[PDB]
Amino acid sequence: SKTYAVLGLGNGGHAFAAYLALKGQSVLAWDIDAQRIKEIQDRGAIIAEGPGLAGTAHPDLLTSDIGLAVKDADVILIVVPAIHHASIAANIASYISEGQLIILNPGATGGALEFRKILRENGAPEVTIGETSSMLFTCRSERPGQVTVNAIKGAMDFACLPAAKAGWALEQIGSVLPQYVAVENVLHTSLTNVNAVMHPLPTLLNAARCESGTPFQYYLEGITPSVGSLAEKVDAERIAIAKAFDLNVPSVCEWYPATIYEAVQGNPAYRGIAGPINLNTRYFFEDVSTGLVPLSELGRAVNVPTPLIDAVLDLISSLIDTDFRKEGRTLEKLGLSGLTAAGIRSAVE
Amino acid sequence: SKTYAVLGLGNGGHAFAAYLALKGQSVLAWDIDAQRIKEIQDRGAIIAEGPGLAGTAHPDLLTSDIGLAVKDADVILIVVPAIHHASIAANIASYISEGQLIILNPGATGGALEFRKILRENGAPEVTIGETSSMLFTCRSERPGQVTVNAIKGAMDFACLPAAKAGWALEQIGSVLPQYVAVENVLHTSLTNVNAVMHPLPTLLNAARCESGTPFQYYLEGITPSVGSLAEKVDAERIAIAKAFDLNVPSVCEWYPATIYEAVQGNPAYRGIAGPINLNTRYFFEDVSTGLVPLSELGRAVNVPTPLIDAVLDLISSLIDTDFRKEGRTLEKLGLSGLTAAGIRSAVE
């Protein structure tokens, strides 16, 4: 039985914190929002319900003080939108200690790398930092202190920095989180960012609908055959980038069907998912910064063309007046600036 | 009083043919469609109605034989979609004679140039070829032999090859078509292609709606503020191309308002215009081939960047699997290959 720090008490945060507490571990949870922490404190528990997980959980601690949640943890689970990773790394830098395990859920593209870079810049001790490319849970918290859990993934790719510590890492969480399965390195998990394909493009191709708040089923109506075919050509660029590092990451289709259109039209799970109701959506903010941007940067490195990814990237930036190539995850933010394709491979081992 | 050949008996073709015939000129009209020519023949007239033009017109001739319509004409008006210009030039090459005036209504970007190139390649006599950037009439033909004319533009830019013949040209049609006003040269008319801005982009940004046949008012609902702002940034590229040749062509706004959104939301004329109901639309086929393509090619020549035009161009090509950069109007098709910005200016004088 160990101490887990759960950072971020959003939908996922709620689920991990309940899951862990119901499994007999000590859970210390944090969220930047004091108010939210205050409502959960009043309630005195986190109620989990649904097919995937049901129970009344009791974290050992709820706080809005990051150091208090982290300082004494054995494992630190970070469950926030990838756009926040940097901020969290800088903030916890002073509390971490040699021997802790940090896991980004998930890392989007380059979460562990970016995380490692910031910690070293802030003179932190060397620690093992892992990342998963998927979300363990499908859930929704209607209010603080509550979470509905539809399901829990049965297998999850997991990789860390440094890669040799993958076994030890998994040896640590194995009893409680046997879903994690080690892949070669963090390039594998980071290049398996399906959201970078499925979110920005279809949203761009439904821009007016989204801006105008005109309701539509994101998957069912937002992705017609030609939109699915275009997404497949963007996916092919991702795959070509993975092959240039010698990795065999799965295509969007494999991630779910001979086509994306078939895959999407056929998952009943997508029944009822609405598209964005405005352009200030994560499908752009997060998936472009932590997905398209790094993908493009990477392809530039290994000299693999990404004309479609770039075209999408450039149109979205202008469409919303955000210089994503500057604000997103650049090779520099990942600590990969001036490395050759082989140098990059060597940096993750 | 003279002989006019009206080529193309679509909406515009119907209107010109009626207008001219009601004005006492001899009209010989053609259309590639025998059937259509046959229905109009049966009816024995063209009925024009509406505020802009009303009357029962009698062309002197209706035929599906191009040479018969052209051989004896003094002025030849071509009223077809710009994508057809090439074909028509090649087909009439053998019937034209020194002294005739050809006018493309309109020329889209580079209509007169492309037209001139094909005629010379086919060993035709030298003739004056003009183009207008606008459509004289706003009309609709519900059936062959009929046309509803809302209105007739009061002023139209007109330019020709060779530019010095602009006065003579206008001296020729002046009595019947006083709406035409000479501008400097064909670069002016060709760079004043507002459709290249207003059609491809908004359609792309409503791709799913269009493909799915989901009804919407093209202007009113397809162009939201951010879509209008993006169009303005594409327009700026067009304008930068015009400035590099020393021309002052009007912005989309001037062509109609401080913004495109304001302009469009405010014209009652756009009340009731639906967006495309599929992707096999002229807003792509015509406006990309005869608008975006040549604009991009031109900017490349005068060394003016057109990242947004290119981005739109590349996304549409892939979106519909059509290599527009190959099939559209290239510098080569315009007979401008290997000319310096100044050489291009010299070719139109």
Side-chain angles (χ1 to χ4, degrees), chain B residues 261-276:
Chain B
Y261 180 75
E262 191 184 290
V264 121
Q265 279 286 325
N267 186 179
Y270 286 161
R271 277 209 205 192
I273 301 172

Side-chain angles (χ1 to χ4, degrees), chain A residues 106-147:
Chain A
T109 299
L113 288 158
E114 180 175 45
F115 213 84
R116 191 183 56 185
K117 161 120 152 349
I118 308 282
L119 284 189
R120 285 180 166 171
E121 279 186 350
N122 285 282
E126 283 297 300
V127 290
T128 305
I129 302 175
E131 72 171 31
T132 50
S133 44
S134 64
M135 242 314 304
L136 185 60
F137 302 106
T138 320
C139 61
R140 204 179 137 20
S141 162
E142 215 237 319
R143 80 167 37 72
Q146 188 275 342
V147 64

